[PDB]
DNA sequence: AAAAAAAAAAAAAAAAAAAAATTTTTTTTTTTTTTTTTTTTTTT
DNA sequence: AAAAAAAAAAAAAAAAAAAAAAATTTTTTTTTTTTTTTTTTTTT
């Protein structure tokens, strides 16, 4: 939330100063599988979790 | 620009040959630890490479960094034995060294930042000590142009604080993991830290909590002091402009309050935190000091100051004195080895030239007129500094051992008049004053001039000078110093052979105990005031003569000249 | 951003570049511009009547608006002295300008500055006050990573009296990857920085009004201008300064004077050199030479009648003998010392006034108006940061100069036993606890006294009409008497002459010069001084009812020396000649013996 | 914050500046700078594999960290046109390095375009998916204020992939003193932007699984180089994005591709030259120019036997007649289109592949994989602006090229008239409500049919056993039918043929595992495509005596005694076979690179429409 | 010897400066669903 | 061959996810200016 320098100046750093960096970050794969319940798992009048 | 693994590569080449192995020889004995600092010489690396040596003037503090990471590096091939590890602080870094090896693991990497570094564990020190083609600038002209550059500068110190711990890698421990962390100093100020780095902690997620202490830090030997123009330097009517200095290592203790000094340095800046910008003080961080150009029989005695004519038995006491009467301390009460000498004077006979050449001679020395240096002046007195009530001194304790050259004694204040009678009779100050409780120490020589009973009774000679007009010795007075004008020993010699003379010591025979009693008793019955005070003064005349005679043990002669002196000087 | 097109900017800058060309027109900026490129000089000076002369209307731009005319006029002279030179233009970075000549309603005071002269270009006088520690401004820093060994270089700006935000005044720590730096302060440049404090002149302030001060910023080429006790005078713009971020603010803008120039007080010109001058000087120097003192003492002070050996040790005490400095250390001062005393209305006070006048680095004084600390230095504490601090007396402002010392009878003798230090070394050993010092304060002192009673009383020896002990008579070398004789033919000339004047410039360089010559002394004068003074020091030489006045003494030797090579330099011959030795002896005796 | 000096910046400028410098070498580098600095474009493209061998290091490096390195690459680039040419250096304010060469490991497919290779150079075949407009994106604003007669240049960084700040986003509209900023459009420098979207071919992708797409961020000099639908290969830049300002993140960073460079995947486009390869064309133009258009028509289609008629057709066909476009744009089309009509197991359907493998630009129809819509264009909304836009169909792609259509009996009444105009005049008019227009498909049509009955029945006539009205039958140019005679001689001749061709093996490259002008004569047994290429420009106009001739061989064909009783007629003589004559003897011309069509030419169109047209049915 | 001027040190008060600081709501986008038209396909 | 029925396509409308957008002074510190008091040094 606050730059933490002590030494921005005279005056200090802004309310909320951080923009991210998006070059220097460094990330990895990921991937949102939608699993559903095992059909014959399922009891018979439900639905599949 | 360059590249400085370059830089370090040429002065590690340089270092290890340039030449007996003269810079070998420094860097085994420092690898051993026989010494703690060291110091380049630039006219000594101007002997091959002119190149580096006006880079080093140019951005010294930065080939400062080079050259001691670089001997450094250089240590331990030329270590050859086991040394006894001397201080507490050779124990830390052995024992640190040691757990580093042990859990060294050498492929194994680390970071950037995890590592002992140089500024703690060098153990020594490296400075420099400019070369003669660079001309030491005056005080004023070391201007912000001049700040990095290699600078010497020749002033007079006026006031220098104590050895002091400065820190300079401050050590904390931690609370659950039990690495050490360090953070290296560079500033006035430092905020200690809280929270410990180490990488225990970082899989812990434990709370640091680390204590700083002194025992695993790294102090140094910190000085400020002060310096001053050179009253030749300064302009027309400007007063004399000051300077700080920073004074570190074996650069410590060199200079003291009064001394002539020339300080070879950088002038680099400190945060001055009300116009904007970035403004900044300015010390200079001295990296060679010299004193200089005050501290560095019959043909002798006329040496002294050659421009004033006749007054040869003055001259002569004048010698003695300057060569100085055996100091003794027999039985507890003190019989101080002083000579103690005023000149009453008609008005103008050079006696205050004589005591200005005195003042330019002795290695300690004060001239005082009347006023310029009262109560305060002559006494000690309370300054604010790490802020402090500093008790400083003024001129005798500033000239605690050498000469004071107190001018127109005779219309001084009541209480200058009081403080040097106490000086004269037993060497040191007492003060229960306003701010000031004390007892200095002040084992001054006292060469007082005045204009016409004190004065008789509490010294060990006393000078009147009448010039009664003869026309003989006036008319080769006259021609003399009109040669002067026309024409307008060396004093390091004098002064050598002066400071050679100090420290031989005699000790009186018992041939010349009947000798000093009948002489003694007979100028008694001369004077039937002379007592006690004028036998102490013939004894330590006798003495000095002996000195200056070189030979340890007194003679007739001596007691002889004593007389001779003293009888020219009452009559 | 960055501007392309400016009407203003580019038209200023024509202007300017038009102005400081000159080399059609008379040549005068052409000759500055080659002064200060020779003599390595990069602030050029700029005469304001000469800028209304050929552009009327960019001066009164210039001086309605300071910062933008003055940024232009910088860079107008950056393109200058680039088409000049190129090299020398490279290496300096940027060229200043100051200003000078007549600023009619901006010559102010510190009192009379309102805020109407807000971002003008004001000229101030009044002293100054305060000259605060020299300092550097960082203004490119440069920067070497350890880990990467890649430098950097941050830069800076002259926002002193501008909008300034943090992001211009950061100054790095860090690297974009946490590698932290090193600093490289060698490589970096740096500007020093000192704030002055101008208070209304003592004089001209109204009576009984608290004074008018305000502060002044000073930068490269400008820090060691003026000490405290200057009677400065400091043309520069008067200017706001931003109180840092607020949140609240009262409209209560402080002001400073960002000073383009500093001068002193115009007196002391030595510079005034010209053809004319060396001219007329030569011509004196050589078609006259046996009668040149003679001629110059007469015209010396042509107001006061008679006076004539008296006038002539003034000359003497005015040229000043020769500074004789050893190769030990020794140094045997060259200044003659003066004692006037006379009757009342001998015009002791208008001799006095008339050094004070002509003479550079000349300082009054009266008896009680100085006590002590304030005729030789004094020793202060700062009461900021602790230290003490030096503050310097009438003495030392007037080192190489002279001090003017009126109802020296008057004075305390606890002066007297003050100045016995500088009477014969030209130094005070000013000293108290936390600093000594040794300041040259080598200058010569003219004094007036009235004798005792009042009045001389013409039937007593002059040590009896003089209440002054032979020690302090010795410290002065020239003891003078002056007595109103009322005689009918010097009643008679006395008034007609004073009557005349109820009804120079030459001088002033010939004293400068004459002082900066250094004559040397011939045998013959060696032995023929040698002799007088031995003539001199004999019962002989004096006689009943004509006691001496002064303890003779080798002082009197050697200020007869003095007043030898006095003479010598008034003829510009470099060789003290029997003829200046036989004045001198002529001097010193008129001086010396007083009849009763 | 300027920095003094980078070693690695330093280094890396050297390196490429030493690469750039090509006079030692055969000056391939600095040939490629003038021409470019010739054509004014501003890309030069540096082969990957020339980098490698010169520096693998910096090889390695730049295929590992981008743009830094390639920001080197092109100040280096900038300063050596300088040498070259200061002037034209100083025209633009930066100069570009396209790539090319094999990417070994650097080369994946979106699918397997994963988070290792960001800031890496990554290549990528895939399809286009969406076409973004072209819009500005501004550089450099100019603005002029006119209460102070003030100019002004806010200047912006294409910041597209790392951190931006406001400060660097304002666009000025006020001056200090409140005044009103007038923008100065003309002034000020833009640079084009488009947004496409690279996908998985669905020839390479997973047979199963969704498709799988990747964003590309094509800025100035990549405009149009990329159009829905195509196939292109795009090597460039992986990176992150950054997400708006904002005191909260999750950890996404949708990320794109800016390219570096995209060309045609297709690589069909392919006019690869040397001097010496024309100084070969152009022998064997003139030396048996006569004769060459057999030569070509046997050379055509090896690993077939036979069909010598059907090779010289579909020799007219892909060197093509001339279109025409007349004063008043009366536009006579300049394709021959060809039926190959006939019994199962006649290659056929080898020739439409072989065509298709060989001729630039083919694409394969079938009966009911395709159909209208699919063939011809289409038009339909956006859904993001409610407009009409055009999706260009087979025909429309294959405009200038050729189309396989794969069981031409099999497309149904609506889609077989729905090619008509596209057979004649080679444009399909789609229009809706919203949006009209005539898109342009000059295509070409090899279409094998299959006869009525499953197989020809001698005696039947042509007309009764093709299932295709006359309607169409016209438009069709030829109509070739292809029997199988079942004699045991012919079938000794195709079947020692085909087992050759079975018995034929890549030379050497194997060893028992399974997967110039003239040709080396192997007993068993590239520059047709050159010499074609070449002479498909080419316009033979018709003499004098060549068009009396044709023009009275067609009134013979009209005549109905130019065939005798017996034969049945296989395709009606309307005008449409006059000018199939026309174009057949262009196309033979054209063969021959003759620049006029003459009587020989005019000979073999006629020989060609005789034996194709009237077949011989049998009693 | 007493008076007084100056010095340093200590304290009060007014002006300027320093420092502290996430949550709620809205809008684009994507994705399906539904209606109705158009198209295609099967039947007599 | 044309009519009827069904399937697919095109286009408009709705529901949730997740990234964007907007609002937003007051109290404490502390330096500097001013005054005051006790003392020492100096003068009458
Ligand atoms: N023999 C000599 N050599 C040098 N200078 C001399 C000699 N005799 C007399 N003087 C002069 O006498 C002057 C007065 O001397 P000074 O030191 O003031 O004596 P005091 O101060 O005791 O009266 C000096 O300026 C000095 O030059
Ligand atoms: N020799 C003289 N010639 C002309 N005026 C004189 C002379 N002596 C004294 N005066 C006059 O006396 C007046 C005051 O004299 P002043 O300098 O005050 O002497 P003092 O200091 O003894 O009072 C002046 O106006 C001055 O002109
Ligand atoms: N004229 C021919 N020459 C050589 N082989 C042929 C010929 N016609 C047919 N064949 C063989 O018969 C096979 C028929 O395949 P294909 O062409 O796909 O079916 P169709 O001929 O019915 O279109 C081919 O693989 C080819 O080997
Ligand atoms: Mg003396
Ligand atoms: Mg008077
Ligand atoms: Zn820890």
């Given at each position: ?49 | ?158 006031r220098v604080?104590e ?90 203790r060199?200079?003291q309050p009064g001394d ?64 100085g009467?055996?100091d003794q301390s027999?039985?507890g009460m003190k019989i101080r080895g002083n000579?103690n ?21 002795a290695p300690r020395s004060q ?9 305060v002046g002559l006494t000690a007195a309370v ?7 500093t008790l400083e001194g003024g001129a005798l304790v500033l000239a605690d051992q050498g000469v004071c ?13 009081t403080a040097i009678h106490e000086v004269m009779e037993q060497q040191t100050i007492s003060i229960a004053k306003?701010?000031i409780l004390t007892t200095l120490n002040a084992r001054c020589s006292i ?125 | ?432 606890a ?163």
């Amino acid at each position: 939330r606050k730059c933490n320098t002590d030494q921005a100046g005279r005056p200090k750093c802004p309310l909320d100063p951080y923009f991210i960096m998006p070059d220097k970050c460094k990330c990895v794969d990921f991937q949102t599988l939608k699993l559903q319940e095992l059909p014959d798992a399922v009891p018979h009048g439900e639905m599949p979790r | 620009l360059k590249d400085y693994a370059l830089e370090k590569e040429k002065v590690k080449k340089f270092l290890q040959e340039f030449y007996q192995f003269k810079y070998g020889n420094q860097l085994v004995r420092l690898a051993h630890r026989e010494q703690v600092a060291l110091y380049v010489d630039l006219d000594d690396v101007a002997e091959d490479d002119p190149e580096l040596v006006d880079s080093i003037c140019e951005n010294a503090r930065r080939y400062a960094k080079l050259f001691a990471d670089a001997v450094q590096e250089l240590l331990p091939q030329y270590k050859e034995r086991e040394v006894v590890n001397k201080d507490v602080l050779d124990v830390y870094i052995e024992h640190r060294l040691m757990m580093e090896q042990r859990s060294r693991d050498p492929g194994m990497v680390r970071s950037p930042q995890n590592q002992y570094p140089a500024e703690l564990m060098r153990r020594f020190e490296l400075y420099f000590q400019g070369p003669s083609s660079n001309k030491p600038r005056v005080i004023r002209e070391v201007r912000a142009d001049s700040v990095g550059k290699l600078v010497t500068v020749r002033g007079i110190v006026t006031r220098v604080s104590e050895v002091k711990p400065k820190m300079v890698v401050a050590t904390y421990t931690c609370d659950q993991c039990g690495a050490e962390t360090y953070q290296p100093i560079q500033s006035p100020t430092f905020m200690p830290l809280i929270m410990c780095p180490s990488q225990e902690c970082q899989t812990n997620r434990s709370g640091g909590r680390l204590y700083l202490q002194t025992r695993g830090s790294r102090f140094i030997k910190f000085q400020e002091m002060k310096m001053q123009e050179h009253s030749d330097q300064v302009p027309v009517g400007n007063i004399p402009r000051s300077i700080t200095v920073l004074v570190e290592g074996e650069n410590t203790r060199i200079a003291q309050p009064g001394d002539h000094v020339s300080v070879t340095g950088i002038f680099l800046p400190i945060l001055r935190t009300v116009v904007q910008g970035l403004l900044s003080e300015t010390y200079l961080e001295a990296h060679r000091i010299v004193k200089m150009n005050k501290s560095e029989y019959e043909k002798l005695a006329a040496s002294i100051a050659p421009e004033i004519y006749g007054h040869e038995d003055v001259k002569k006491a004048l010698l003695l004195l300057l060569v100085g009467g055996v100091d003794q301390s027999p039985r507890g009460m003190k019989i101080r080895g002083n000579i103690n000498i005023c000149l009453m004077g008609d008005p103008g006979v050079a006696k205050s030239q004589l005591l200005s050449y005195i003042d330019r001679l002795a290695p300690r020395s004060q001239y005082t007129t009347g006023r310029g240096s009262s109560g305060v002046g002559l006494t000690a007195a309370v300054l604010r500094d790490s802020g402090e009530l500093t008790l400083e001194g003024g001129a005798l304790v500033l000239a605690d051992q050498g000469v004071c050259c107190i001018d127109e004694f005779d219309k001084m204040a009541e209480a200058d008049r009081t403080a040097i009678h106490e000086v004269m009779e037993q060497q040191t100050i007492s003060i229960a004053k306003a701010g000031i409780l004390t007892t200095l120490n002040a084992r001054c020589s006292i060469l007082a001039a005045a204009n016409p009973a004190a004065l008789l009774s509490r010294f060990d000679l006393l000078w009147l000078i009448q010039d009664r007009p003869d026309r003989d010795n006036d008319l080769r007075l006259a021609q003399h110093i009109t040669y002067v004008h026309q024409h307008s020993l060396d004093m390091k010699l004098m002064r050598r052979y002066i400071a050679m003379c100090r420290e031989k010591q005699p000790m009186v025979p018992e041939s010349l105990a009947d000798y000093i009693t009948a002489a003694y008793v007979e100028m008694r019955r001369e004077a039937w005031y002379t007592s006690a005070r004028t036998l102490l003064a013939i004894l330590r005349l006798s003495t000095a003569l002996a000195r200056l005679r070189m030979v340890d043990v007194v003679e007739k002669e001596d007691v002889n000249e004593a007389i001779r002196l003293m009888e020219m000087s009452k009559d | 951003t960055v501007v392309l097109d400016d009407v203003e900017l580019r038209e200023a800058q024509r202007d300017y570049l038009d102005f400081l060309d000159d080399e059609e027109d008379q040549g005068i900026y052409q000759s500055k511009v080659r002064e200060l490129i020779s003599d390595n000089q990069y602030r050029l000076i700029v005469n304001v009547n000469d800028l209304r002369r050929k552009n009327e209307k960019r001066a009164n731009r210039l001086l309605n608006n300071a910062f933008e005319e003055l940024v232009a006029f910088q860079r107008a002279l950056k393109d200058f002295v680039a088409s000049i030179d190129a090299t020398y233009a490279k290496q300096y970075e940027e060229f200043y300008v100051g200003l000078e000549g007549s600023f009619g309603s901006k010559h102010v005071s510190p009192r009379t500055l309102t805020s109407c002269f807000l971002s003008c270009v004001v000229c101030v006088e009044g002293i100054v006050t305060k000259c605060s520690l020299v300092r550097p401004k960082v203004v490119r820093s440069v920067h070497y990573c350890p880990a990467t060994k890649k430098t950097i270089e941050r830069r800076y700006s002259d926002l002193t009296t501008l909008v300034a935000f943090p992001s211009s005044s950061v100054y790095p720590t860090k690297d974009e990857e946490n590698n932290p730096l090193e600093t490289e302060y060698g490589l970096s440049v740096y500007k020093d920085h000192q704030t002055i404090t101008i208070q209304e002149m003592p004089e001209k302030a109204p009576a009984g009004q608290l004074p008018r001060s305000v502060d002044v910023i000073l930068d490269d080429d400008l820090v060691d201008k003026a000490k405290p006790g200057d009677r400065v005078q400091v043309v520069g713009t008067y200017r706001c300064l931003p109180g840092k971020k607020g949140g609240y603010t009262s409209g209560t803008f402080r002001t400073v004077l960002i000073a383009c120039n500093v001068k002193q007080m115009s007196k002391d010109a030595q510079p005034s050199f010209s053809a004319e001058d060396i001219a007329k000087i030569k011509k004196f120097s050589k078609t006259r030479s046996k009668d040149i003192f003679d001629q110059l003492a007469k015209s010396l002070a042509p107001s006061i009648h008679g006076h004539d050996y008296v006038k002539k040790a003034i000359l003497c005490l005015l040229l000043g003998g020769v500074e004789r400095d050893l190769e030990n250390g020794s140094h045997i001062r060259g200044d003659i010392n003066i004692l006037l005393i006379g009757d009342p209305s001998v015009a002791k006070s208008q001799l006095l006034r008339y050094v004070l006048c002509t003479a550079p680095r000349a300082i009054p004084t009266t008896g009680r108006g100085s006590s002590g600390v304030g005729l030789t230095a004094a020793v202060t504490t700062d009461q900021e940061t602790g230290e003490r601090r030096l503050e310097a007396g009438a003495m030392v402002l007037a080192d190489r100069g002279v001090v003017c010392i009126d109802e020296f009878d008057k004075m305390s003798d606890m002066d007297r036993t003050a100045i016995h230090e500088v009477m014969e070394q030209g130094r005070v050993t000013i000293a108290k606890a936390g600093i000594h010092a040794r300041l040259n304060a080598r200058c010569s002192v003219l004094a007036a006294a009235n004798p005792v009673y009042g009045r001389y009383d013409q039937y007593k020896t002059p040590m009896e009409n003089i209440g002054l002990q032979d020690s302090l008579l010795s410290r002065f070398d020239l003891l003078f008497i002056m007595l109103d004789q009322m005689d009918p033919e010097q009643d008679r000339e006395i008034s007609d002459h004073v009557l005349r004047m109820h009804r120079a410039a030459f001088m002033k360089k010939y004293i400068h010069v004459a002082k900066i010559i250094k004559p040397v002394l011939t045998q013959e004068s060696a032995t023929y001084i040698a002799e007088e003074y031995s003539r001199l020091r004999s019962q002989d030489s004096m006689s009943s009812d004509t006691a001496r006045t002064s303890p003779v003494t080798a002082r009197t030797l050697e200020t007869l020396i003095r007043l030898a090579t006095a003479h010598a330099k008034a003829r510009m011959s470099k060789t003290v000649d029997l003829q200046d030795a036989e004045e001198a002896v002529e001097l010193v005796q008129y001086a010396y013996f007083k009849k009763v």
